[PDB]
């Protein structure tokens, strides 16, 4: 059987159906509006109502509130409101169809086939892999034939996100460093033949003088990996690549500066930064975006042991700078210090890194937006514009020499791994990373607060969220224009 | 005797003196450069060197590094760098003159008499009032006669700040609610005859239905006050006023949600918001700025007792909204809810409030900038521009409906006093306040992280800092143009 | 004369793991070895006419799958069993064997130094290092030595009162931490008394004089090296 998701707008006499809803109402000789009318209150945005037996092929029709037809970019909220309405409403419709165990659903494009595809595929996603109680996986399809490219591009963007949620969600004993490197490799090679994957072993990592990455890694028995992803999509094979770097800690216990036990299981998602940048690169190659992109993810685990990093140790990063490890839980900093050095080798046009770096970001913006520190207002503008379309917001945070001073604490080393005071922890972790970039166009995104979803963005179940993957794909999309 | 502070720029053969330094070098027949040269390394920004006996009237000459003569607005740091250099350098020079107990100092204007006045008067400030060991108070004067208005306007701006540091620093048993109201009254009436002060007692406050302010206040024995300050500086006496509101908690213990003991003494500065907006209004009236300004500061103490607010209580704000007090330490929120209602009575052109609201602001930006939440980009732009001149930065933080949802937790009341989750505490405290403003141009400044100085801004001793008072005076200055 | 020094090169706490805050300073838990070895290098540069042996057990204290467990009973070189109730009271354990071995040398005097206890820091907090000694003659020579150097010593009690607190049988002859939290410096020293039979032993607890901030003006802020000159000066005068 099929289910049909149909949208309507908020209230004229009648609140308007979409063209597809209106066309369905004519095909059932006015029944759909009749029952909608005797059924109760007008549906508002994100609200659904389900009707049965109106048509032989659609035993379940779910009508969904899209909000005001007029909705556009909201200057205060910094997103396109209308598309947010369409993702929210279609996900709520689709999820009613899966609770009735119906295996396929025709979705009305609602005026924007791309965001309706994104609502349906985000909305229906689940991670029930290691459970014996799995949900019915239903397959969403565009209702109609008129903008199947826009539907399929949304399908594409919502899967990139879903790959990243899956990557993040999987338990750390399953998603080890080589296992993640293998999933990404497999996915990237299915995306395009214009790809190259290098799963670099410890041997290579130590030939590259990556001392601060290697010192995080040694306290675990799990072999680290340096994952080098290439998408050569430019016609000019010598066109300078954009490089994405991502913190891939596959589990963070804290090391010897050990984490509290409460809710420590969420640190399986400390490789969110690698999940995010690698999924956006798989999507860019599926999209055959005409640009060269390198992806760099140092993968390792941070564990207490008799060979772990000790508070006070001084390690040497690939640029020769010494780093005093004052707290072993400020490990991503260390990892990214070498990876951001290596990023420069590629002669990049742009360097963007992503990391679940700091609980300070969560106290600061708590999932309303991911924080970005950038030395370039041009980069800031392109990322900000990219998030107005996706609804997955970005908010700029300061790169002031003020926070740098706080981490240039000599004592034994050139730089300290944690700021001198507790204040502005996101700001001093970003200033730490500035010490390893000499590039005029670098952006640091702190993903820690947008790592999980509970109820905040309606089209995502409660779980690891995969954010800001579509802001990154959209940024690449527009850049390759 | 007099001391003379003279500046020089960083390195040509010779690093250049200012006109005044160069003129002094000619008056001592080349001695000053001679000794500067045999004395050691070239002074860099903020560095000083002191020379004795070059001239009969100036037994101590302190030469001060101004940095690069070319310094202007820094696009990355968002301030005028050169003026920051001049405040820093002159304060370091002036403080050498006070450590030698010299009672007067001629200060070179360094190309910007206003910032050199600001360095000297900020630099030399102290709060030693209740000590028997007091510092020599030296008197800084412009070296020369050429821009005595620019010198005196800086004197004016730096005193407004110093009034606010003094207000903040004083122990809470001395700076009670009527005592603060009396200091401000006295200062405002010395500033202009175009002023009106209303120290409103409890009787008035309860006739105005200010239930959420009154419920914070009742747990202390100290009578609360509502301070209404008017500066009628406009030619049009019916010109709509700008209104400034400020949290005046004179000591915050936490109430029944009691604070930890460690460093609780700093909550004598929880009236920083009232200190800041009242000092800027005293400065605006000294400056005879042609605008109408009302200042509103609810003053009270937050103490545990047998009549204190209890976690879970529901109080009624002046607009009739009920507020569930889930945590009694989120009291400023409550106080400001009534004051921001009353602000609307004045038919204001602009509503700006300031509050040491949240330690979450300190985790977020930690004294690199004060955070501002505003529903208007026009207000944001004027405040941001104002802080480029003063060096006392502002950084915009988001007013998203996302944080509103978190505080619209019904349960017993229309709004909860703390957000549902711990995340984004600054953002949900600001969204709480949005619930009490209907004005299209409101700005909320969270002053909590810029409350203290340790070493971060060089021209301020370690202590309560009085920030962002000059950003506010400067904003008023430009608005009255 | 034999000098013994705790050389823990990093102390994490083991399984009784330290809090994260400021744990980097435990790189200085070998301060006791640093102190006694530097004084012996100085005594030989000074060609002091005496025989000096220096003994420093050096190791690291880390959590792992083979680390000491709270409750374990280990056997010291004199055959006494020691119940390790808390793995962060490790220097105690280390010094127990080293102080046994010290006796082999037939020494005139046995002095050990250790950053043993944060309880010393609560007690005297860098105004002086604490010394527990069964001899007033040793106390007098060390005290006089610190009048010259300015790097003070303050005597702390070796009462059988604190011994009783650590003679808690339960599984072992001696427990590694005192029964109550009180007098932690005093019960850690009484623990060590259980391994000395020599009539002239001094225990110096160096924990509170480990760092300098502003307290003694001629030292920058950092690890301070105290009480090294009190020890050199004591040797100097002894060799007279
Ligand atoms: Zn960590
Ligand atoms: Zn981490
Ligand atoms: Zn409070
Ligand atoms: Zn407060
Ligand atoms: Zn220990
Ligand atoms: Zn130890």
Curated annotation (Swiss-Prot), chain C:
Mg(2+) binds at residues 11, 88, 90. The modification N6-acetyllysine is found at residues 179, 213. Zn(2+) 3 binds at residue 27. Zn(2+) 1 binds at residues 11, 88, 90. Zn(2+) 2 binds at residues 6, 11, 29, 90. It is found in: Cytoplasm. The active site is at 18, 92. The modification N6-succinyllysine is found at residues 179, 200, 213. Transmembrane segments: none annotated. Substrate binds at residues 6, 11, 16, 18, 29, 88. Cytosolic metallopeptidase that catalyzes the removal of unsubstituted N-terminal hydrophobic amino acids from various peptides. The presence of Zn(2+) ions is essential for the peptidase activity, and the association with other cofactors can modulate the substrate spectificity of the enzyme. For instance, in the presence of Mn(2+), it displays a specific Cys-Gly hydrolyzing activity of Cys-Gly-S-conjugates. Involved in the metabolism of glutathione and in the degradation of glutathione S-conjugates, which may play a role in the control of the cell redox status. Homohexamer. Belongs to the peptidase M17 family. This is Cytosol aminopeptidase. It comes from Bos taurus (Bovine). The gene is LAP3. The chain holds residues 277 to 516 of 519 of the full protein.
């Amino acid at each position: 059987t099929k289910g049909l998701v149909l949208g309507i707008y908020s209230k004229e006499d009648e609140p308007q159906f979409t063209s597809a809803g209106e066309n369905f109402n004519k095909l059932v000789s006015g029944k759909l509006r009749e029952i909608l009318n005797i059924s109760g209150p007008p549906l508002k945005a994100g609200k659904t109502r389900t009707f049965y037996g109106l048509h032989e092929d659609f035993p379940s029709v779910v009508v969904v509130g899209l909000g005001k037809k007029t909705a556009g970019i909201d200057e205060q909220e910094n997103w396109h409101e209308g598309k947010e309405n369409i993702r929210a409403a279609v996900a709520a419709g689709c999820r009613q169809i899966q609770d009735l165990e119906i295996p396929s659903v025709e979705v009305d494009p609602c005026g924007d086939a791309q965001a309706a595809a994104e609502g349906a595929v985000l909305g229906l996603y689940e991670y029930d892999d290691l459970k014996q109680k799995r949900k019915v996986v239903v397959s969403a399809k565009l209702h109609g034939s008129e903008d199947q490219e826009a539907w399929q591009r949304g399908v594409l963007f919502a899967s990139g996100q879903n790959l990243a949620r899956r990557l993040m969600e999987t338990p750390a004993n399953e998603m080890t460093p080589t296992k993640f490197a293998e999933i990404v490799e497999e996915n990237l090679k299915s995306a395009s033949i214009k790809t190259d994957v290098f799963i670099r072993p410890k041997s290579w990592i130590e030939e590259q003088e990556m001392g601060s990455f290697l010192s995080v890694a040694k306290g675990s028995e799990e072999p680290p990996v340096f994952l080098e992803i290439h998408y050569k999509g430019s016609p000019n094979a010598s066109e300078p690549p954009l490089v994405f770097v991502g913190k891939g800690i596959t589990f963070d216990s804290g090391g010897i500066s050990i984490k509290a036990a409460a809710n420590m299981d969420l640190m399986r998602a400390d490789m969110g930064g690698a999940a995010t940048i690698c999924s956006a690169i798989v999507s860019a190659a599926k999209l055959d975006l005409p640009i060269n992109i390198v992806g760099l993810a140092p993968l390792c685990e941070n564990m207490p042991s008799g060979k772990a990093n000790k508070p006070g140790d001084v390690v040497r990063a690939r640029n020769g700078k010494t780093i005093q490890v004052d707290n072993t839980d400020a490990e991503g900093r260390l990892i990214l210090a070498d990876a951001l050095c290596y990023a420069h080798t590629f002669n990049p046009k742009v360097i963007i890194n992503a990391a679940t770096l700091t609980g300070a970001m969560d106290i600061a913006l708590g999932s309303g937006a991911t924080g970005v520190f950038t030395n370039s207002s041009w980069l800031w503008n392109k990322l900000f514009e990219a998030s107005i379309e996706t609804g997955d917001r970005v908010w700029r945070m300061p790169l002031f020499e003020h926070y740098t001073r706080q981490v240039i604490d000599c004592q034994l080393a050139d730089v300290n791994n944690i700021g001198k005071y507790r204040s502005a922890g996101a700001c001093t972790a970003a200033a730490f990373l500035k010490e390893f970039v000499t590039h005029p166009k670098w952006a640091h995104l702190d993903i820690a607060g947008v790592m999980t979803n509970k109820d905040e963005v309606p089209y995502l179940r409660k779980g690891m969220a995969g954010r800001p993957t579509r802001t990154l794909i959209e940024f690449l999309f527009r850049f390759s224009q």
